[PDB]
């Protein structure tokens, strides 16, 4: 129910 | 109430939204969801005391509960926690293997994780490989090294070494490593690096029963006690399987070994929760060791 909810991302590829 | 939270992984940042009743776990299977990381075992939630010390976050209780430095957002790093005892063997998923390789080598060139200078060149030369794959001299001419960071501080200290001159002994390496795919460097790296004195152990300054300064490691085949000014070297060396039981209440810590003439060992950490955590650790390390011999 409260589960976290994702609000942004960065991904580093090197 | 919605809480920021970051979660930091070697090469991701998560920004999440959560509840005051949102739970370690909950926090925690996100993360490896959105990230594609099944062998969770290894991992944990690493955050910063009210007071400042580096703990892992208890999954089975709520976040707000814990006592996380209060600041917003609220800060995680995602990392290992615990070890495999062979890299080649445990380590099956290419992430969970490229996780373990950054942790590990941010740990090697920041001087936290011990290197002689003859490991650390070879270690840069697969590190290299992993990023840049083939030696290729149609792409990568005099100074294409100039711009990574690839040797510990300590090294570059010591010895009279040029740039030039360390980034021509580890292009050597980098040139032997032809035809090496860019997993099979990254393995390679881990593999080295485990064996390692300082690698995968927990170290927590103690005092004697006399009250002299030693440290304590607790890795995935035991405890250890070390004299204050070599963490490399064991003093005494406490297996699992030579411990008959180990004990803690407030801030004592007793080690009692599997041969009753042989004496206890007595050491005190400077609060309860450093004695917490140390046990903690102790009792993960424990069953993960246990459950690789089923």
Redesign the interface.
């Known amino acids: 129910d409260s589960e976290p909810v994702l609000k942004g991302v960065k991904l580093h590829y090197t | 109430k919605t809480i ?2 970051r979660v930091t992984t070697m ?9 005051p ?2 739970t370690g776990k ?2 925690f299977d ?1 993360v490896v969801k ?1 990230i594609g990381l099944r062998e969770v075992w290894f991992f944990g939630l690493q955050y910063q005391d009210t007071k400042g010390f580096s703990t892992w976050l208890k999954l089975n209780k709520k976040v707000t509960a814990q006592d996380v430095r209060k600041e917003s957002p609220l800060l995680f790093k995602f990392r290992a926690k615990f070890y495999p005892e062979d890299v080649s063997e445990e380590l099956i998923q290419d992430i969970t293997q490229r996780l373990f390789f950054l942790q590990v080598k941010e740990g090697i060139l920041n001087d936290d994780i011990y290197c002689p200078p003859e490991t650390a060149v070879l270690l840069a030369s697969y590190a290299v490989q992993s ?1 840049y794959g083939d030696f290729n001299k149609e792409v990568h001419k005099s100074g294409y090294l100039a711009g990574d960071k690839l040797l510990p501080q300590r090294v570059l200290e010591q010895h009279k070494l040029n740039k030039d001159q360390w980034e021509e002994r580890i292009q050597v390496w980098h040139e032997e490593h032809r035809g090496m795919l860019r997993e099979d460097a990254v393995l390679e790296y881990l593999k080295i690096a485990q064996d390692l004195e300082m690698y995968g152990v927990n170290y927590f300054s103690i005092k004697n029963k006399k009250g002299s300064e030693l440290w304590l490691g607790v890795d995935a085949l035991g405890l250890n006690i070390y004299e204050q000014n070599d963490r490399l070297t064991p003093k005494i060396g406490f297996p699992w399987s030579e411990i008959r039981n180990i004990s803690f209440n407030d801030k004592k810590f007793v080690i009692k070994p599997i041969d009753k003439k042989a004496p206890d060992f007595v050491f005190y950490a400077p609060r309860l929760r450093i004695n917490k955590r140390i046990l903690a650790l102790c009792m993960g390390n424990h069953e993960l060791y246990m459950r690789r011999r089923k």
């Open positions: 920021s939270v090469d991701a940042e998560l920004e999440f939204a959560i509840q009743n949102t909950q926090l996100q959105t990023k």
